[PDB]
Design a protein around this ligand. Sequence first.
Ligand code: GTP
Ligand code: GTP
Ligand code: GDP
Ligand code: GDP
Ligand code: MG
Ligand code: MG
Lengths: 431, 431, 111, 426, 426
Amino acid sequence: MRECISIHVGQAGVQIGNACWELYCLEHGIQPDGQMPDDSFNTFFSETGAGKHVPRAVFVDLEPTVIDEVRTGTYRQLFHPEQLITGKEDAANNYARGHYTIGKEIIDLVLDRIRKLADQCTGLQGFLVFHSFGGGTGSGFTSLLMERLSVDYGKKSKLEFSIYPAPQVSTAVVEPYNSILTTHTTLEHSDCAFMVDNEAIYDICRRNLDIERPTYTNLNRLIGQIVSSITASLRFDGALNVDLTEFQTNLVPYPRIHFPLATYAPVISAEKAYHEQLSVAEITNACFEPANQMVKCDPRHGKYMACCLLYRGDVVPKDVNAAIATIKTKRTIQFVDWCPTGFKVGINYQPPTVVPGGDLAKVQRAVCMLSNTTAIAEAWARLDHKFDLMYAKRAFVHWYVGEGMEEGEFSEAREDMAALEKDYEEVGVDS
Amino acid sequence: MRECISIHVGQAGVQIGNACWELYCLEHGIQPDGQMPDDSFNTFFSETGAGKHVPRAVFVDLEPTVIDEVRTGTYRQLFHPEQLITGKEDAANNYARGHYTIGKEIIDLVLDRIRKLADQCTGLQGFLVFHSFGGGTGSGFTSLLMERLSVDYGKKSKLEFSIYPAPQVSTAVVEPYNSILTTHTTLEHSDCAFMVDNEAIYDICRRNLDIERPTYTNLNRLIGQIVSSITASLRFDGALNVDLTEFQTNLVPYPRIHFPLATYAPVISAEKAYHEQLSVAEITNACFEPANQMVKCDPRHGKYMACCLLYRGDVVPKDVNAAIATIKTKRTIQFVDWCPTGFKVGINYQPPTVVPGGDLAKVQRAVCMLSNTTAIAEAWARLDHKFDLMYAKRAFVHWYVGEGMEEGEFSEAREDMAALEKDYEEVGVDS
Amino acid sequence: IPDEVHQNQILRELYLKELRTQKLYTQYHVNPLRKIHTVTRKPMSWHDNLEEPADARFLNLIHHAAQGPRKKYPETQTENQEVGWDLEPLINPERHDRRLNHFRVCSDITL
Amino acid sequence: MREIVHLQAGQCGNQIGAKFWEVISDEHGIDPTGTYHGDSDLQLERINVYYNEATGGKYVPRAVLVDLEPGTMDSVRSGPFGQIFRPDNFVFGQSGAGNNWAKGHYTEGAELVDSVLDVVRKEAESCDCLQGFQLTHSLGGGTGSGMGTLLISKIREEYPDRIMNTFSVVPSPKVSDTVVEPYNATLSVHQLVENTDETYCIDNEALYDICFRTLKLTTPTYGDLNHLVSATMSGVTTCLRFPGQLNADLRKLAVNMVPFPRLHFFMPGFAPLTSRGSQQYRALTVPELTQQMFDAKNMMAACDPRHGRYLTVAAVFRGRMSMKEVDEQMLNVQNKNSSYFVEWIPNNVKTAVCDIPPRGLKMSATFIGNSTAIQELFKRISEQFTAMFRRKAFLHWYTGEGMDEMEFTEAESNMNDLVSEYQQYQ
Amino acid sequence: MREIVHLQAGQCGNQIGAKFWEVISDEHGIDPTGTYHGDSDLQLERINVYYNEATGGKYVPRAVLVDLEPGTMDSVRSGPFGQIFRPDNFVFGQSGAGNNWAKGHYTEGAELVDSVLDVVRKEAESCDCLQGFQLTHSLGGGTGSGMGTLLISKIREEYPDRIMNTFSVVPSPKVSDTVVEPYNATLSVHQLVENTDETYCIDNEALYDICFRTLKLTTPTYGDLNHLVSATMSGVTTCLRFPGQLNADLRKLAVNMVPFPRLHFFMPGFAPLTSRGSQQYRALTVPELTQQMFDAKNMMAACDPRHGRYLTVAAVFRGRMSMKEVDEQMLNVQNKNSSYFVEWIPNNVKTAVCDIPPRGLKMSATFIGNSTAIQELFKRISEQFTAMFRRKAFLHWYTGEGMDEMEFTEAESNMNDLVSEYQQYQ
Ligand SMILES: Nc1nc2c(ncn2[C@@H]2O[C@H](COP(=O)(O)OP(=O)(O)OP(=O)(O)O)[C@@H](O)[C@H]2O)c(=O)[nH]1
Ligand SMILES: Nc1nc2c(ncn2[C@@H]2O[C@H](COP(=O)(O)OP(=O)(O)OP(=O)(O)O)[C@@H](O)[C@H]2O)c(=O)[nH]1
Ligand SMILES: Nc1nc2c(ncn2[C@@H]2O[C@H](COP(=O)(O)OP(=O)(O)O)[C@@H](O)[C@H]2O)c(=O)[nH]1
Ligand SMILES: Nc1nc2c(ncn2[C@@H]2O[C@H](COP(=O)(O)OP(=O)(O)O)[C@@H](O)[C@H]2O)c(=O)[nH]1
Ligand SMILES: [Mg+2]
Ligand SMILES: [Mg+2]
């Protein structure tokens, strides 16, 4: 009955998506041809008369070199070929080109396949979109993707899983230019929106998973485990079951603030799993470490508004509420005085499943915390400084302006970003 | 005892009728020689006492090269050798030549065979006339063919299947001249007039059948499945059964408006049909898709008058009424205020039969849709412009004038056609 | 104002040295294994439906092209094919056991 | 069923038709003895369009060869395929015309057209239902222009409602041969305005440019030039002899390309031609075949089609192909070339595809185009006639045979009216 | 899918492509006859970027070889890899420019532009969607730099929004092989500053420096030099033909590198190059590849960015490589070198990675980086141009052909303004 639609936008969306959909098939025991050798698969797969399953995913891309690798590999028989949407020409790291020039040629094809998938749904819990701030139409076409979804669909959930531009490492020069102009869309047309930046995931894989040389496949296996633990309360029985709309309402203090931080615990190797036990209290303390956080910001600087936790495995409610008491006793961590009861707890019996060839090991007890802090103002004023530092001498403006957008729209992104950072300042003051 | 006679006039009626009769022969399990290796075949065949089956078809043309391929082809033993009536000299895309000076030699031969075929019938249901508006023989000779059938048979139903001249692509120069004079006959001597043009078949075969360059053979096999779906009610039983008189009363509100639009669903290739789940409540949406319309006109600009739906295969009557309720709740689909009961349902038990070498897929559920809309007003006004643009200073008129028809008949066809387009404007308005 | 009596012999010697330097294609009929188009034959015109043989080499090329990367290559060639390369289960899939494998089960009232 | 009597006139016409009967007997697999040795039996389905059955399974062509010098036919009879013609149809005089239009029309024409019309009466009466006639000639010689125009005039008053087809080689300035060349072409166009249903215009400049630059031939012998013309004649009438999905015979193209009765001059071209070395560097596709059909280098008339407006275009295709590709290509060339094509006739193009191409080739192209650039040929011919007639050049040869001097004034008044009709509709 | 059409200009223009079409043919496994000998099916997946398809399984390059001296193309045609090109692509004149820019721009340019734009319409219209065009030339001769500036100006005007990649070989004071080469360089960069999207500055001093000091070749004939130039030309646009974990095609490098439209001059350099004896003591790891890459020894320009400021940096990598190492090594060089990098643009570097390495090699990279050291080459060229123009040197072989004398001062006003912009951004 319950079901969602995945919208993998961009080259990062495809590499994330095939990491997620590889994990889903082995989780539900479905072969690459789609036929198995119970309604757990109903949330993402669609049943036909012949015994197959079609994933409810739409791949949004503007370059054919990233779709044809999907159509050639092992999963060529899995996905329906009309779900993979390829543009004729890439915007090539341009928000403006994917907003006014390139994106309106295939905006009709995306909304048509959205209509077909939502027609098959008997009741639609929400949408998941996957994209990155850095790229052109991963940030650009996503901006006009939300405009059509919000107007057509009123109160349907639309989750925005994003990748923030890292403060130090980058693969572009116009990367801060693309990120700030997407603040207009996400502030207005997003029910929820996560972010993890790549520099933080770089620190964890070096020291926790014991990998000298990882690529984006080992990062996207980690991000697949985050989404799997989120949606498994929809797919499997739980001692406490938490739906998609449940923790959506319970983490946001204001409609202007819908930006949690995601962390996962434990992340250890199969040789280090031979040594250390993994209990409920041991994995609870690991989510509060600023080293193991998956965003380069320190909650020790800021203040927690609310907390959402997602437990999986041999998890007893006795040990959950015992470890919460220990965390409130330590004075290194703080909570705002206007949220005394800030936690939310969910438990599922099924342990997380592992992928063959992956880096992690199979674990009984795991937790995926969703905490909203005032430490996100640390990673915004840094990017607002660098967006102001480049734009002081008026650089790269001729490429964006000449494509159709006026020069005053850059100044519009200044005040909306300046006002949004002011709304996070008034949260942290105590009454 | 319910029997019909098919008449293929001109070249365009031959290959359209060629796609039909190779489809009909395999639908009834008959060998190419015409002898079977059940009274269903009596609608379209006559059983000779020796054991051979003869089609109820008269192939008439003025050029011998298009019929001589039939006399030596695969089913050269199927037809009677005298039914393949062949003229001496072609009309050369002249409505004047095929109506007055060339068609007067062959009209005596064809009415004797219609009389001899209809004398064999113990009960008659209707005629099936296949042609196109563009060519001279399919236009001029069909004009005086139905004039003689009107004075011989009083209240006999005559289905008129015609290929409409496409707005953009055209294989003739004098093509708009033929269609304006042709409508004068069809306006008075025809009970229905099914309109399908070539250009929309080109686009539907591209994105749905995934064949980039279709020829006439792939075009007419789509036409054959529409005609086979209409006649499947007569030949085969069903939960709901319709006749030729059934939808003639139910789709023609006024004597001047008998031009329905015919589309088919699904049109899915064998590679994709392995993937999708096909149900009754979702193939009704494929009928009302503006891209899947078989005529190059926008149904969203016009208002519907009536719709006739013919489902085939594993169809349950709860599913058609759930699908109609889904369609009527939408706002893009519009209906006139003087017709709330705008639908009609037909369900048959036998699924459509695919042809070896065909492009379609073996599907249980298929639907044929016949609507009479106000969206065909724009499809004639675009051809009303082209004829009057030719007739500004008498282009190509001297070939028709020297034949034997007078100059004032071109204006009389324009005056009748301009009066007919004003009928759509006065009935399309709400009260 | 050109001199055509010289232009013609310039073209003649040009074509002649092109004839001297021309080397023909050595008859290695290579075709892409991806896609090639067809034209549908006539229903009644029996000049199209003659009995005629079909190549088996290109059939083998189709049956080798429509295949998985693991079946094609012994070792992986690029990095994007690394996901899903090993699809085998390390433990047998005892999905029938409701004891250790909790799953959602349909009820008769909802259906 | 539908038959055409082929007719050849003059030295230029006889050499054109000798190659024509050599190239289309290859299509039907007829040996020079006249028997049948072929591979596909479709070649006897439609062979009576151009041939007459003889006893013993021998086929003879339906051609009449008229000339005034026996020095041309004995070369034709000593040719490769010279043994198939009937010796009765060889009609000739003994005294030459001398490249004078008045000789072949008034002096020596009246003694021979009694015999020639007797021969063509027997060939036309032996048909089942006559489609029309075919004539190959040139507008620069005494026999090709003088007797040819009178011979059509006698035909039309006997057979009023037929399809009269003529091929003419138009005189050219850069390949000017005779000193009285504008005299012959001006007096012959006067008759071709009111006496023929369609005329094909061929220039000798375009045949030289095509055979040297595009074909890259070392030796442009007249056989190779005539091999270019013969591919046009075979491709125009291929819908009579060869079945296809969409067909267009002579009368279907007669109505469509003639909007007004004084405009029946066309520009042919052929499009699968390739150079000596670019055989393997080419892709045989319909978009490749369409652009070379429209290419101004491949026009068989020595005038720029870019300098005028197309009235109507007919493209006759061959080989196995799919015509969704046909209609998309012809809309592309109409849409992107808005200025060249006329606006008073949308969809100027007409197409026709036949299943069987010429042997040794997968696909073939036949172009027939009606343009307003034809006035450039007629204006240049008219001024050379005007320069001669002002000083009365070479008139004593023509006026001494019984032809009045006012007939040239009537001819140029008739011809200059035709040039204004081209500009009137342009 | 996305297409770059190749163009040539001059004797240096033809010799660059003669080695460039050889090196990528072996990359795509194409023999001199033109067959396919490949072990990976992924090569043929994206091959339509540079090859057109012909019948029988033939691939022909999309190159137009332009020259005014046919002796150069005859050496190209008689070369090992010269028969692959279609013969219509060779466009030649009959009289040379004589190393004069004005001769190749005004006098003989107008009679040869009609031929080359007649060809490039066929190389553009015959496909689905164009990504851009490519030009290679030298700024020392009047052939390549002459109409090579002027062929762009019409085709930029015809095609307004495309991508125009150019390879320019600037003249040098040490390898000065032409007296009039400052007159050639100054009036070409003047046209190049407004007509061109991208331009790479390669100089023969640095080509000599790399082959002598680093590669230790004893007899480096220009084929070996053109091997090094064409390896950079392949590595820049290798994302068009090969998918990667992170891809960046020509348009991706187009927007991000140029901060302003008037500064599109870059310096290429390459890393894996070593000497014949130093291979077995050298490894290939990402640090080794980036350590040698920003080294000034392997730069292919006659400028040193140690005296200047890196505006924007790029690096396009190839081979089996981890994302972190490509990111951690490039972070250190930005942080440690606080003087060579600009301060008003942080994270100056763009990065791309390609899975498919060049054959016979495991790892590789291609460098593009815009610096204010390019004004060293611009100032020393301009001062020699002003020195000779002060004393009326060689002018009547330009102004005697019908051109104004004041166009130089407008070009001088453009030349010193461009170097003024590089100073105020430094
Ligand atoms: N976390 C994470 N980020 C990625 C991954 N792949 C790409 N990115 C981010 O994506 C940004 C660049 O965008 P692209 O990968 O080119 O894809 P895109 O967003 O569609 O941009 P275009 O290709 O120009 O359309 C980089 O700044 C990266 O930060 C990935 O696998 N994981
Ligand atoms: N949809 C469709 N249209 C066809 C087909 N065959 C012919 N036509 C149409 O028929 C029109 C011309 O008429 P023809 O079929 O060629 O022959 P005709 O009607 O007898 O006219 P004449 O040949 O002059 O006697 C063309 O413009 C085509 O659009 C077909 O198989 N399918
Ligand atoms: N196409 C073509 N033209 C020819 C041939 N032979 C001669 N001509 C042309 O015919 C013209 C002379 O015509 P002529 O032979 O005197 O005509 P006649 O009086 O009927 O014999 C010359 O200008 C030639 O260009 C030929 O074999 N083919
Ligand atoms: N990098 C490089 N430069 C060359 C090469 N050949 C010639 N040049 C340069 O080109 C200049 C002369 O080129 P030139 O032959 O006159 O060019 P053209 O006039 O266009 O044919 C000299 O200054 C050389 O520096 C080469 O193979 N590589
Ligand atoms: Mg994208
Ligand atoms: Mg016909």
